[PDB]
Design a protein around this motif. Structure first.
Motif, mmCIF file in Angstrom:
data_model
loop_
_atom_site.group_PDB
_atom_site.id
_atom_site.type_symbol
_atom_site.label_atom_id
_atom_site.label_comp_id
_atom_site.label_asym_id
_atom_site.label_seq_id
_atom_site.Cartn_x
_atom_site.Cartn_y
_atom_site.Cartn_z
ATOM 1 N N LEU A 21 -2.432 -5.087 -5.042
ATOM 2 C CA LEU A 21 -1.906 -4.352 -3.998
ATOM 3 C C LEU A 21 -0.327 -4.211 -4.044
ATOM 4 O O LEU A 21 0.118 -3.409 -3.356
ATOM 5 N N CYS A 22 0.505 -4.945 -4.969
ATOM 6 C CA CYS A 22 1.825 -4.617 -5.260
ATOM 7 C C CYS A 22 1.700 -3.208 -6.079
ATOM 8 O O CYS A 22 2.866 -2.515 -5.961
ATOM 9 N N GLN A 23 0.651 -2.971 -6.731
ATOM 10 C CA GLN A 23 0.662 -1.515 -7.466
ATOM 11 C C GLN A 23 0.572 -0.272 -6.632
ATOM 12 O O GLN A 23 1.257 0.700 -6.984
ATOM 13 N N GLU A 24 -0.083 -0.369 -5.590
ATOM 14 C CA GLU A 24 -0.138 0.831 -4.554
ATOM 15 C C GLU A 24 1.173 0.833 -3.879
ATOM 16 O O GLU A 24 1.454 1.962 -3.752
ATOM 17 N N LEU A 25 1.851 -0.080 -3.511
ATOM 18 C CA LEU A 25 3.108 0.160 -2.952
ATOM 19 C C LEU A 25 4.441 0.305 -4.113
ATOM 20 O O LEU A 25 5.319 0.710 -3.759
ATOM 21 N N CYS A 26 3.976 0.169 -5.415
ATOM 22 C CA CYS A 26 4.796 0.486 -6.515
ATOM 23 C C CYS A 26 4.534 2.040 -6.608
ATOM 24 O O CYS A 26 5.341 3.131 -6.761
ATOM 25 N N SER A 27 3.357 2.730 -6.565
ATOM 26 C CA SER A 27 2.832 4.012 -6.689
ATOM 27 C C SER A 27 3.381 5.090 -5.529
ATOM 28 O O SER A 27 3.897 5.955 -6.022
ATOM 29 N N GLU A 28 3.193 4.518 -4.422
ATOM 30 C CA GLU A 28 3.552 5.408 -3.127
ATOM 31 C C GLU A 28 4.908 5.603 -3.075
ATOM 32 O O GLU A 28 5.381 6.835 -2.950
ATOM 33 N N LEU A 29 5.846 4.674 -3.401
ATOM 34 C CA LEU A 29 7.184 4.669 -3.614
ATOM 35 C C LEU A 29 7.732 5.334 -4.666
ATOM 36 O O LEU A 29 8.590 6.070 -4.750
ATOM 37 N N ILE A 59 8.562 -4.493 -12.843
ATOM 38 C CA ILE A 59 9.466 -5.265 -12.394
ATOM 39 C C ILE A 59 9.209 -6.150 -11.092
ATOM 40 O O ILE A 59 9.989 -7.090 -10.805
ATOM 41 N N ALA A 60 8.167 -5.822 -10.384
ATOM 42 C CA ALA A 60 7.818 -6.478 -9.371
ATOM 43 C C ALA A 60 6.935 -7.546 -9.715
ATOM 44 O O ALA A 60 6.562 -8.440 -8.745
ATOM 45 N N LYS A 61 5.742 -7.296 -10.776
ATOM 46 C CA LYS A 61 4.819 -8.311 -10.854
ATOM 47 C C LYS A 61 5.381 -9.727 -11.596
ATOM 48 O O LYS A 61 5.211 -10.764 -11.534
ATOM 49 N N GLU A 62 6.820 -9.331 -12.162
ATOM 50 C CA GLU A 62 7.571 -10.656 -12.776
ATOM 51 C C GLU A 62 8.133 -11.368 -11.524
ATOM 52 O O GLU A 62 9.139 -12.174 -11.811
ATOM 53 N N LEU A 63 8.085 -10.721 -10.305
ATOM 54 C CA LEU A 63 8.738 -11.538 -9.108
ATOM 55 C C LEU A 63 7.600 -11.907 -8.274
ATOM 56 O O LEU A 63 7.732 -13.148 -7.785
ATOM 57 N N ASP A 84 4.475 -22.300 -6.094
ATOM 58 C CA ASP A 84 3.711 -23.226 -5.097
ATOM 59 C C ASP A 84 2.688 -23.826 -5.847
ATOM 60 O O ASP A 84 1.467 -23.723 -5.267
ATOM 61 N N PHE A 85 2.839 -24.589 -7.162
ATOM 62 C CA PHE A 85 2.100 -24.742 -8.088
ATOM 63 C C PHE A 85 0.624 -25.143 -7.837
ATOM 64 O O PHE A 85 -0.271 -24.617 -8.364
ATOM 65 N N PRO A 86 0.151 -25.949 -6.679
ATOM 66 C CA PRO A 86 -1.276 -25.891 -6.610
ATOM 67 C C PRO A 86 -1.678 -25.233 -5.399
ATOM 68 O O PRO A 86 -3.181 -25.012 -5.192
ATOM 69 N N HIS A 87 -0.736 -24.313 -4.633
ATOM 70 C CA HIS A 87 -1.446 -23.745 -3.503
ATOM 71 C C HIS A 87 -1.150 -22.381 -3.493
ATOM 72 O O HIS A 87 -0.263 -21.877 -4.251
ATOM 73 N N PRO A 88 -2.060 -21.403 -2.872
ATOM 74 C CA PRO A 88 -1.748 -20.044 -3.021
ATOM 75 C C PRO A 88 -0.703 -19.541 -1.883
ATOM 76 O O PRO A 88 0.042 -20.519 -1.398
ATOM 77 N N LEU A 89 -0.415 -18.340 -1.979
ATOM 78 C CA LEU A 89 0.450 -17.546 -1.022
ATOM 79 C C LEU A 89 -0.698 -16.951 0.093
ATOM 80 O O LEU A 89 -1.501 -16.372 -0.049
ATOM 81 N N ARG A 90 -0.288 -17.415 1.442
ATOM 82 C CA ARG A 90 -0.913 -16.547 2.521
ATOM 83 C C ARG A 90 0.118 -15.757 3.027
ATOM 84 O O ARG A 90 0.639 -16.125 4.084
ATOM 85 N N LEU A 91 0.165 -14.447 2.446
ATOM 86 C CA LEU A 91 1.087 -13.480 3.150
ATOM 87 C C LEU A 91 0.407 -12.708 4.042
ATOM 88 O O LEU A 91 -0.820 -12.692 4.269
ATOM 89 N N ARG A 92 1.286 -11.857 4.639
ATOM 90 C CA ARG A 92 0.874 -10.911 5.834
ATOM 91 C C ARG A 92 1.678 -9.440 5.734
ATOM 92 O O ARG A 92 1.380 -8.337 5.935
ATOM 93 N N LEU A 93 2.557 -9.587 4.691
ATOM 94 C CA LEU A 93 3.560 -8.228 4.521
ATOM 95 C C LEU A 93 4.244 -8.374 3.251
ATOM 96 O O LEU A 93 4.681 -9.230 2.780
ATOM 97 N N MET A 94 3.941 -7.367 2.362
ATOM 98 C CA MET A 94 4.493 -7.307 1.001
ATOM 99 C C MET A 94 5.351 -5.783 1.158
ATOM 100 O O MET A 94 4.785 -4.866 1.644
ATOM 101 N N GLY A 95 6.408 -5.770 0.637
ATOM 102 C CA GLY A 95 7.070 -4.556 0.321
ATOM 103 C C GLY A 95 8.444 -4.416 -0.547
ATOM 104 O O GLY A 95 8.969 -5.180 -0.849
ATOM 105 N N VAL A 96 8.365 -3.056 -1.253
ATOM 106 C CA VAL A 96 9.288 -3.072 -2.219
ATOM 107 C C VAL A 96 10.358 -2.029 -1.693
ATOM 108 O O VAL A 96 10.272 -1.291 -0.942
#
Ligand SMILES: Cc1cn([C@H]2C[C@H](O)[C@@H](COP(=O)(O)OP(=O)(O)OP(=O)(O)O)O2)c(=O)[nH]c1=O
Lengths: 430, 249, 248, 253
Positions: free
Chosen positions: A330-338, A383-387, A395-407
């Motif tokens: 889902l970071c790729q669609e936000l990279c593409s549209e931008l 440049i954003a997949k390396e962030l 968060d070494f054993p735990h996932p990220l529970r996000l609700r918003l990403m943005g570039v």
DNA sequence: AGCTATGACCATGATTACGAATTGC
DNA sequence: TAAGCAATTCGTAATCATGGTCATAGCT
């Protein structure tokens, strides 16, 4: 109530109250001797400010009347006597004046206001129409001044300090228009704005408020004085700027918001006369640019003569995520549209700053500056997949529970730095 | 169980003295035919590609493909300990996180151990194409040139033609023009010119390229149009070390 | 009127450049036995013992028995002013607090009149033990092994058995585990009684091994729990011994 | 126009190496006799003078006596881009903003053309007229660099005394007065320290500058010093019979 | 083994980048 | 279960350019 949003504003309430107490502890440690040199310095600079208080110009602000609702109402003739609501069940852009009194305002959810009015309609907007109905109004605004400064799609600072003098030798049909001849408008500074409002009225089938002032911040609030389809005016004389600068809340001025309101309810401020009566308090307490803004909003000072893009972002919200592949995809669609929207203006950015939001509402803007100028949907994503990598695996054993990403592409270059445009290698690889 | 005995130890010392200043971490692919390295640095301007195949090793064996991430300053601090003559015996087991260097003086048998890491370098390179200008020149002169225009500016203009090739740089103290005119046994300047091509690059990578100078004495600069400059050094009987650099404007 | 004339002038140079890094001021005991020094470092771990006999001084004359306190940094910055082929004449008097030096060249003499000081002396004796292991190795190879090992950690575990002397270390990357087996002035000789495995700290051995250009070979002298001797023998002048204590 | 080819391409890599940290802007009076320079430094006590005359050049042509304002730091950053055995040609137009340097290797395949942006200043031609001296001392160059780098660890002032039998370089400090004593040489290459005199000399000088003045030591193998009373010390270097390089520094108090 | 070159390592302001917080439409 | 863009503010901290020091090596 007791929501997650309530929890994060509760933490923010704790933080702003902590800064309230951290201000009150620095407020008690000043004396009647610490109110001398700072007060004399800021009023010496206020003497340097107010002596050259030049206001020979006449700046007009022209807002609209529920712009995102009104441009729908010029294109929806069915329910002109009804309260309309744009947005959806998460957020409202702006609702109309048949619903402002009932509470249906901006920056309010689609579930808070909708439980207040059971008889309402909430329809998502059409963001392509407003970009044309802005330019139609801008066609009328360009005639009275070529250097008009549209801030948003509806606000418009205009300078009519020159058009009024070159209007005196005009005939009585150049200064007379027709209903879509109609009533002749005079040569006064109220009348040029009455002409502007009449043309925008019977050229867009709509209404538009207005406001005349010697300065910009006065125009922004005079445009709110007689508000629906109305106007106001101040005269350019240094006495008449003082009689309106009193008896005003600071819930009205722009630049003093919600938290700098509560940090001034502590020091006993409601009107701008009280805000003037704390020179050596606010000069020592608050920061440099903020006490500058307070000392220039006190005397009613600002822009006496009127004047590219610096960022471009795409953010997107969604439901709860807990996987590992979905964030990277889902970071790729936000990279593409931008990357699509970055080439329509043909701009070469050189910074990508991702921005993530937890399910319990914390911002995380992780930035990265490269030396290759970034344009395409694959020169961003590497440049954003390396962030996303640096802040998923921290968060070494735990996932990220996000609700918003943005570039956010930034740092668009000059003319001195667009002739040396280094290129990425990912154009060449395969 | 990767195992590799190199009877000329200074080759490995010279390679990891070349690669530690430009990039700082690498992910070596060690498979059954040699050691490969593919790495672009942080700014994503240059790429460095390296192959030493399994024939100039005095002994080599490997049974399964390994990916070995290596801090190159840690390995350049370990490999500062061999002399210029140590038979270097790099061993590494498969699923262990340590690379056991074993030096052997010509009985001073050192035995160093390094920690690896998990690095995921990008698994892509320049596809195989054809080039327009191929200069081949003495590498001491190429290093002198790339270190002799950084005193002027951070832009080199390599203008290639038939009689020779010209390097020019223009900075805040003036400008400069070095002209190479073609030859008349390893001071040989051969220009396989096709189309006269003029390009401009960043010297802050051309100075880091010239740190593989004692790996050869002949360097091939291969250029085209809208295509990265290639600088290539050949490690004799071993393989090659190539440097791709992106141009300005 | 003490006069000590040495004809190989590079000796004192390599000594004092091996001492000016570690200890700051020290005491010079001047007698018919020669020139003596025992001092401790400024962190009270290492013990420097310099002994110079009177046989190979090209002319010696010491009537009384003097003690001279010197700051070694100023003395060594005077000992960076002579070539490696000069004749040193150290001199002192009882009527002055000035240690005179004269560098003779085979027509450029170099006079120096350095200040002394007055320190509160400490004459501590070393009880002589019978060492478990004494090894002799060429000086440059030990200098290389310690310097090389200093990049890896700081805890050097010197091991010794009759077949081999085995340096280990550790650190944040992994243990650099050097060996040296049993093996012509550049040999390695191991006189062993019981196998030893004892800890030391490298950050003072690095201060020690700057006496490498004195002799071609060094001797390490070790016992269990006794502080070790690292001894660099000037040929036919004396020796320079460094004492280090094990940790834990 | 002005064009000057010089076969010894190392002399400008050393004349313009002894003069980069001392001064930073100078006035190259390029005229028909040859290249000159005169410059008091950034502290205005030490007087550099420099002359490369015409007859030592390989070829040389100019008639417009021009006066180029030359930045020596950037010019040394450019002349440090040449080989040691190259051949150096200087090129200038009449009303030129820039100056062109030509580095031709004797291998002849590589040729270098650098172009340096000038400036303009006016310097004092504080002329140094004909004088007669008291003592002259003609000595090796590595020895003089060694002597000054020795005495700059001891103190930071030097008494220099010259008598019939030789010279004393006496340097007191906080830790004891160093002293180095040199005598002549009878019937012997470079070792000769020939010291001639009409009346003896005791003068005194600083040592922040004699670690700058003997940065010119690869330019020659014999330096000379000259001294008298109420006249500054003259530190003279000779170049490969093209001319010379003088430094001047005054006594103290 | 000293002199000098010179490349690795290191202190270190300092400009430049990062990030949360706040304001608008 | 509470937006979507842009702009701006200050204080933190990362990277870079800088000269100084040290070690090892080519040259003496
Ligand atoms: C304030 C605000 C406005 N908008 C949009 C919707 C509005 O139609 C448009 C104009 O902003 P405004 O002109 O301030 O609001 P408005 O014109 O709708 O109402 P009024 O006439 O009373 O000022 O911008 C938002 O999307 N989000 C917001 O938070």
């Amino acid at each position: 109530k007791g929501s997650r949003f309530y929890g994060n504003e509760l933490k923010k309430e704790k933080q702003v109250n902590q800064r309230i107490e951290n201000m009150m502890q620095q407020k008690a440690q000043i004396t009647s001797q610490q109110l001398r040199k700072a007060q004399l310095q800021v009023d010496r600079f206020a003497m340097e400010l107010e002596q050259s208080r030049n206001l020979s110009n006449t700046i007009v602000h022209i807002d609209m009347d529920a712009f995102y609702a009104a441009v729908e109402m010029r294109d929806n003739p069915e329910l002109k006597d009804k309260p309309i609501a744009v947005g959806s069940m998460s957020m409202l852009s702006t609702s109309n004046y048949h619903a402002r009194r009932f509470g249906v305002r901006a920056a309010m959810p689609g579930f808070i206001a909708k439980r207040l009015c059971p008889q309402l309609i909430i329809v998502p907007p059409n963001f392509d129409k407003y970009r044309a109905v802005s330019k139609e109004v801008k066609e009328i605004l360009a005639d009275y001044d070529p250097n008009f400064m549209a801030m948003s799609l509806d606000e418009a600072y205009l300078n009519i300090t020159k058009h009024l003098e070159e209007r005196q030798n005009w005939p009585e049909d150049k200064r007379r228009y027709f209903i879509k001849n109609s009533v002749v408008f005079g040569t006064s500074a109220q009348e040029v704005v009455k002409e502007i409002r009449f043309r925008i009225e019977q050229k867009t089938t709509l209404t538009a408020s207005a406001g005349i002032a010697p300065n910009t911040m006065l125009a922004k609030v005079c445009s709110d004085k007689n508000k629906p389809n109305g106007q106001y005016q101040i005269l350019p004389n240094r006495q008449a700027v003082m009689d309106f600068i009193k008896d005003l809340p600071i819930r009205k001025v722009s630049g003093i918001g919600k938290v700098t309101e509560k940090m001034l309810k502590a020091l006993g401020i409601i009107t701008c006369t009280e805000l003037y009566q704390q020179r050596a308090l606010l000069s020592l307490l608050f920061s440099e640019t903020s006490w500058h803004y307070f000392l220039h909003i006190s005397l009613g000072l600002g822009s006496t003569h009127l004047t590219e893009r610096k960022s471009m972002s795409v953010e997107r919200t969604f439901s709860e995520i807990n996987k590992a592949e979905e964030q990277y995809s889902l970071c790729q669609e936000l990279c593409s549209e931008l990357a699509q929207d970055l080439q329509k203006e043909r701009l070469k950015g050189r910074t990508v700053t991702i921005k993530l939001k937890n399910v319990n509402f914390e911002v995380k803007t992780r930035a990265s500056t490269v030396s290759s100028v970034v344009s395409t949907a694959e020169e961003i994503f590497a440049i954003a997949k390396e962030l996303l990598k640096t802040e998923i695996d921290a968060d070494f054993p735990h996932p990220l529970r996000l609700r918003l990403m943005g570039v956010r592409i930034s740092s668009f270059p000059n003319e001195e730095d667009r002739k040396h445009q280094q290129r990425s290698i990912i154009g060449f690889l395969q | 169980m990767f195992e590799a005995r190199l009877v000329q130890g200074s080759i490995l010392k010279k390679v990891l003295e070349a690669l530690k200043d430009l990039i700082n971490e690498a992910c070596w692919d060690i498979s059954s035919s040699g050691v490969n390295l593919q790495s672009m640095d942080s700014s994503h301007v240059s790429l460095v590609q390296l192959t030493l195949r399994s024939e100039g090793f005095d002994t080599y064996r490997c049974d399964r493909n390994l990916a070995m991430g290596v801090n190159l300053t840690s390995m350049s601090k370990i490999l500062k300990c061999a002399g210029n003559e140590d038979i270097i015996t790099l061993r590494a087991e498969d699923n262990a996180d340590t690379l056991a260097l074993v030096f052997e003086a010509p009985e001073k048998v050192s035995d160093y151990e390094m920690k690896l890491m998990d690095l995921d370098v990008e698994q892509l390179g320049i596809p195989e194409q054809e080039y327009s200008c191929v200069v081949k020149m003495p590498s001491g002169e190429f290093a002198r040139i790339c270190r002799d225009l950084s005193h002027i500016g951070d832009a080199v203009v390599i203008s290639c033609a038939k009689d020779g090739v010209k390097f020019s740089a223009s900075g805040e103290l003036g400008n400069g023009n070095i002209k190479l005119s073609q030859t008349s046994e390893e001071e040989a300047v051969t220009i396989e010119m096709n189309e006269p091509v003029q390009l401009t690059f960043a010297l802050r990578y051309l100075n880091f390229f010239t740190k593989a100078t004692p790996l050869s004495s002949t360097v091939t600069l291969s250029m085209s149009a809208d295509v990265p400059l290639v600088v290539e050094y050949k490690i004799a009987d071993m393989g090659h070390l190539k440097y791709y650099l992106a141009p300005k404007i």
